[PDB]
């Protein structure tokens, strides 16, 4: 099978440049063309351009002329996208995809997130949400993940073993920091008799924090 492996997420200062990579296996890029595509967070797909690795000839959508430079290394079977003079309009996921017309864009890299911001990388505070004493058969608990940058964070419950009853909400950005919340619903007979822990991983800060949801103190 064909495999396209892209480089990891990037946090880049406004005005700076960045270079993304895409390494192929299962075919030689010499034999085809390699393409790059943009996806701004809640918007559409935009073709950036392509390269013919055999002769290094490139083509770009006029929108990305100057902004984007595409290259390739034949003996590394890799393709690259360099983006210059970055703005927040360049914040997006960038995909590499294999060329050819029959079929069309069948093979895609996993995407590389580029975040353009002057804000400082900050790990989240993680707060437990235990119910007031008012709370049938089920109980809902939650986790508030506050004051981090950049996106994303990954929130799990009991390391994934609570999966079916979980909702994790999109983050909201305010004063250069994100906040999100996650809920989990479990049978009332199982909490607090059994441990329920929300796990929060923040790739950018290489942090992973656990917070146990402990019942509120009040009834002693």
């Amino acid at each position: 099978e064909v495999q396209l492996q892209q480089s990891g997420a990037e946090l880049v200062k406004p005005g700076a440049s960045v270079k993304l990579s895409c390494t192929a296996s299962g075919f030689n890029i010499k034999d085809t063309y390699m393409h790059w595509v943009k996806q701004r967070p809640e918007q559409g797909l935009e073709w950036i351009g392509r390269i013919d690795p055999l002769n290094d000839k490139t083509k770009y959508d006029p929108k990305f002329q100057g902004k984007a430079t595409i290259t390739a290394d034949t003996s590394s079977n890799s393709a690259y996208l360099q983006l210059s003079s970055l703005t927040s309009e360049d914040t997006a996921v960038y995909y590499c995809s294999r060329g050819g017309g029959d079929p069309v864009f069948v093979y895609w890299g996993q995407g590389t997130l580029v975040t353009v911001s002057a804000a400082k990388t900050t790990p989240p505070s993680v707060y437990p949400l235990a119910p007031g004493s008012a709370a049938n058969s089920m109980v809902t608990l939650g986790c508030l993940v506050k004051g981090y940058f950049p996106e994303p964070v990954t929130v799990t419950w009991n390391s994934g073993s609570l999966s079916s009853g979980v909702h994790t909400f999109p983050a909201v950005l305010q004063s250069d920091l994100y906040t999100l919340s996650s809920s989990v619903t479990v049978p009332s007979s199982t909490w607090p008799s059994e441990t329920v822990t929300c796990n929060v991983a923040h790739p950018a800060s290489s942090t992973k924090v656990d917070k146990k949801i402990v019942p509120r103190d009040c009834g002693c």
Partner: protein, 213 residues
């Protein structure tokens, strides 16, 4: 160069039903159009190329038609996991994507399950106080949340967030968070979030009292 005008930008249809998306090119693209499914968290997936050619492994309830400048794409026998954004793409001369069509599945209306949570003792040490209200597994997506403090409606300091439609039960969820300073939080005693949804003229009310513990 070549523009691709994809319509409608959004679709809503019931399980077992059929939808069609139109793509109009600014010039003859000689049947070089392709169609993609894109789910949040995944890369695009090819469904159809050369107007109507099904990519092997894709269910045949996906189909395409057209020629010249006018093309269409259809999904029949709709399933919950068909929730995605779909795109057309011309590849007659370089590449141009259409603007996309976001597909919703229409299930039976369902009322939210509502839960309210006081600020954690941990957060209060920071001097801030977030009251969180979860409104889980409802349909349709339209919903109103009202915060009350001491039974009086509060509109500042509120931030709302909606999930994408769930690929399995076709419901939506949303969180509403009211953030106060700790001193303002501790000046009041009753906190309420009220959910109003077309499933009932009566709001769903969840409250707690702030006491000394």
């Amino acid at each position: 160069d070549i523009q691709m005008t994809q319509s409608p930008s959004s679709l809503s249809a019931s399980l077992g039903g059929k939808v069609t998306i139109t793509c109009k090119a600014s010039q003859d693209i000689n049947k070089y159009i392709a169609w993609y499914q894109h789910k949040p968290g995944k890369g695009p997936r090819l469904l159809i190329h050369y107007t109507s050619t099904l990519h092997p492994g894709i269910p045949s309830r996906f189909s395409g038609s057209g020629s010249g400048r006018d093309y269409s794409f259809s999904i029949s026998n709709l399933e919950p996991e068909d929730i995605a954004t779909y795109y057309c793409l011309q590849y007659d001369n370089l590449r141009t994507f259409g603007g996309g069509t976001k597909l919703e599945i229409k299930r039976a209306d369902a009322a939210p399950t509502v839960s309210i949570f006081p600020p954690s003792s941990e957060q209060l040490t920071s001097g801030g106080a977030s009251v969180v209200c979860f409104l889980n597994n409802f349909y349709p997506k339209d919903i109103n949340v009202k915060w009350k403090i001491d039974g009086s409606e509060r509109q500042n300091g509120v931030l709302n967030s909606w999930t994408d439609q769930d690929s399995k039960d076709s419901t939506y969820s949303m969180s509403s968070t009211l953030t106060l300073t700790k001193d303002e939080y501790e000046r009041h005693n009753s906190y309420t979030c009220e959910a109003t949804h077309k499933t009932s003229t009566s709001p769903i009310v969840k409250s707690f009292n702030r006491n000394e513990c």
